[PDB]
Design a protein around this nucleic acid. Sequence first.
DNA 1: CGTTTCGTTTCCTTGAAAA
DNA 2: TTTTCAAGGAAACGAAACG
Lengths: 879, 30
Amino acid sequence: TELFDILSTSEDVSIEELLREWLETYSENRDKFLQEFINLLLNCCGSVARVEDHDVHSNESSNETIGEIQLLFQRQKLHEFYLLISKENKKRKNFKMGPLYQNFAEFMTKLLEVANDLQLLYVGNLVLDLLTWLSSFSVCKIRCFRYISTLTLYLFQDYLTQQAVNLEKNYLAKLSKQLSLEEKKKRPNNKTLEKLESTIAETQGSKVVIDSIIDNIVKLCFVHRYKDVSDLIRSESMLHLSIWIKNYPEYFLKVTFLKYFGWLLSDNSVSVRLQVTKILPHLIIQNSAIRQVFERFKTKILEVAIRDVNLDVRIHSIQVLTEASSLGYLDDSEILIISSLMFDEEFDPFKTSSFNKRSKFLSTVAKFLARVIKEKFDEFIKTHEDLPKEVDGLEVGPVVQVGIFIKILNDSLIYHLKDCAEVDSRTKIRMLTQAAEFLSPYISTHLKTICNLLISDTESNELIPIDRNSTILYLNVFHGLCAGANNPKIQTKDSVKEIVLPLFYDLLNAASIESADILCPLLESFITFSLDDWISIGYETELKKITDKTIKAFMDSTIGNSKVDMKYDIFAKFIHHIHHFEKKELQEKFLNQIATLKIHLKKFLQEKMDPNNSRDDYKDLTCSLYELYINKLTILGRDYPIEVDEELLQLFLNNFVSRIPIMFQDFDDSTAQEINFKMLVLLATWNLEKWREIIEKVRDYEISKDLRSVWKPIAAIIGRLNTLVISLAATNETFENINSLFYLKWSACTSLMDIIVAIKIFELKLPADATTWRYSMSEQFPFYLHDNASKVLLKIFLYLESLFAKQVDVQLERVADEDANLNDLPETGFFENIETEFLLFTVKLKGLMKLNILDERFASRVALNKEKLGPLFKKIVDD
Amino acid sequence: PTNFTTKRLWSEITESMSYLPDPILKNFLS
DNA sequence: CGTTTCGTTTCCTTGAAAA
DNA sequence: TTTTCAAGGAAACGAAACG
C-alpha cells in the first residue's frame, strides 16, 4: 500500500492535487480504488490485516467482506491506536499531530470539491458504494473501526451542507433573477429559455440528491451513534452537528432537531457535556423557533450551571446563560439563583493572582451579571422620568448604573445566606471581597461617582449610603473592588489610580471612624498602593496629613487582642506598609507618638498600679492597661524600635509582672487572654540589636565601659520572667482557673524561650576578637534558664501534648513518676487551635535543646511519642 | 489532610513567631 | 536522586466584531 | 471586504509527589 506512505508522514503537501488521480482512474480501474481505500482506514486501527482487490470488488457482499477482516483483529494481541493518540498528543506518539490530523481531515472535508471537476459526483453510482460500505463498517463491538467509520461519514456530512447552501444561494437564487429578466416584456428568447430550464433543473436535482444522502446518514448513522457507550464517539457525534446546524438552516434549524442538545445536556459521561456547552453559545449568535428550546430546557441549564458533577461544565453553562439573560429568556426570579454563585462555600482553596480554577468561574458569573445590569439600566430609564439636574450638571450614566447595583449584590448575598447556616460578619466580609474582586473591570469607569456617594451632602428623591449598616456594606464592596482591581488586566488600573486617590482624606474627614467596621475596608484599600502609585499621581502632599488623621484614631480608640478585636491586624498592616514606604517624615510621627504613649504609661504606673493602693479591682485595670498602652506599643515596635529607661521598666516589672499572682485570683478567663508578654521580648530584642549595630562600629571611629550596666535591663527582664514563671508554678489547680493559669504560663514560657534563643544567638554570632563582651555576658548573666523554669517548660509541653492526645484519642506513654492526673484535660477557650500552638512549642523546645540549654532527659521525654503523633513529630525528633 | 501538614508548618511558625521584620532576619538561626 | 505527573506562563493560531 | 482584539490551545519551564 503506497497511499499510506504519502499520507501519514507528508506535512506540507497539496491535498486536492492527489484526489484527481484516483477520481479519474476509478473509471479506468474499478478494483484498484476500493482496495487502497479500505487499507488506508485499516492502517490507523493498528493491524497487519489487509483487503485484496477481489474482496473489495464484492460490493454486494459487504457484511462478509468486512467480517472476514474482523477476526484478524479480534484474535490479534498487539494493537494500538495510531490516529487517536496522535490527535490527542502531538509530542508523545511516533506520529505527530501535523501529518495525521490536519491533512487527514482535509482529505475528507475537501473530497467533494474535486469531484465536481471531472464529473464523478453526478455522473451517481460511485456515491452509493461508500454509503453501502461505511454503514456496515460502523456497527461493531470493537471500539477501533466504529470510531473511524462514523468519523469518515461525518466528515462528508460536513461538506454536504456547505455545498447545499452554496448551490442554493450562488446558483439557483442567482439564475432565478436571470430568468426573471427574460419574461418581461413580450420578448422570450426561447434559445436561452431551454438553457435556463436545464441549468435550473440541474441545480434543483443536485439539492435533492444531497438531501437524500443527508437523510440517509441522519436516519441510520446519527440516531444510533448518540446512545453509544464510548465517550469519544458520543462527543464526536455531537461536535460536527454544530457545522450542519450553522450551515444548512432549512432542514436543521428546527425544534425537532434541537431536541438532541436538551437530551444530552444531562449525560452520564463527562466529556459530552463539555462539547455540548461549548457548542450551545453558537446557536444564540444567530438570533419563536429557537426560543422554544430554551423556554423548555432553561431549568435543566440552571441545574447544570449550579449542581453539576464536573466543574469545567458550569463555566460554559453560565456562558450560555449570558446570552440567555441578554435575550431576556430568563425570568427575574431565576436570576437570583445564579447571582448567588459568586459566594461559593469554598474559602480560598486555590489562588487568586495566578488565575486558577476559582478565577474563571467568578469571571464568568460577573460577565453574566453585566448583561443583567445593563438590561435593568436601560429598562429603568424609560419607566421613570429623569429630573432636570442632579449634583453637578447631569450624571445620566454612572448614577443610575450604580444605584441599582447596590440592590443587586445585597440581594445576591441574602438569597444565599437565607439557605445556608448563619455565619459571623467576619466570614461575610471575606466572601464579599472575594466576589467583588472580579467585579472591578465591569464598574471601572463609574466608580468615580461611588466615592461621592459616601459624602452624602446632596440628595435625590425616589418614588414608592444612608444608615450605618448600609454604608458598612458600601465600603466593604468598594474596598474589595479596590484590592481586586490590581491583579487582572492593564491600563484599566492606572486610570483608577489617578482618579480615586485624592478623595481618601475627604473619606476620612466625612464618615466618622468610631466603630471598627468602618475602619476595616478603608485601610484594607490602602495596602495595595505603593510609592509609585502615590508619586506618579501628584498627591504625595496629602499623605502627611493622612497619617496624622489615622494616628488620631489610633490614639483615641482602645485596641484589644487580635482574638477579639480587628483593629490589631488593621493598624499592624497599616504600620507595616507605612514603614515599607520608607520616608523620614513618616517615621518621626510614629516615634513621637511612641514617646507620648510611653509617658502616659509611666504616669499610669505611678498611681494606678501603685503598690500603696487598697483597690482590689485588678481585673478592671489590667484590661485598660493592656488596651490603652501595652498593645499599642507592641504593635508599634514591629517596625519602629522602642527603648525604655530602666526607671519605667523597674516601675513596670515591679508593679505588674512581679505582682501577677496576687492579681490572678480576680482574673477571669477573658482578661487572661488579653495578657501577652510580647512587649517584654520586644524590649530585649531591640536592645539586643542596638548592640549588634554597635558591633558595626568597629570599622568606624569615635565602648564607654557600660557593659555591666548594659546587661542590667535585659538581665532584670529575664530574671523577672523566670521569677514570674516559678511563682505561677505554685498555684491551686481548680477547674475555674486551670485554663487561664496554664495559658499565662504558656505565654510567659514562649516569651522567655524567645528571649533566651535571641541572647544565645547573639553570644555565638560574636567574632572571636570581642573577648571583653563575652566576659561581661558571662558575668552579668548568671543563669539563662533556671532549673525550675525547665520543669515548668516540661509541664507546658506535657499539658499541650495531652491536649493533642485528648483531641486525637491516642493514649500517651510516659514515665511512672509523673502528674498523670492531667490526662483527661478540660475545655480550653484560649487555644483556638491545638495542633499549631503545640507544634510551635515543640519547635521552640527543640531549638533550646540544640543550644545545650536543656538536659538530655528532657530530650528523652520529648521524643517518647514520635510514632504516636504522626510524622510531623518525628520530623522535629530527627531533623 | 489533617496529619500531613509539612509545608504549612513553616508558614505557621514564621507567621506566629515573628512580629518584627528587622530583628527576625538576624535572631533566627539557620 | 531521579522520574513522573500536574500546574503555570508565554506564545501562536483561529475566530468574532467593527470599520 | 480588511483590521484588530480576544479566546482557546500548545509548548516549555517549574513544582510537587512518588518511587
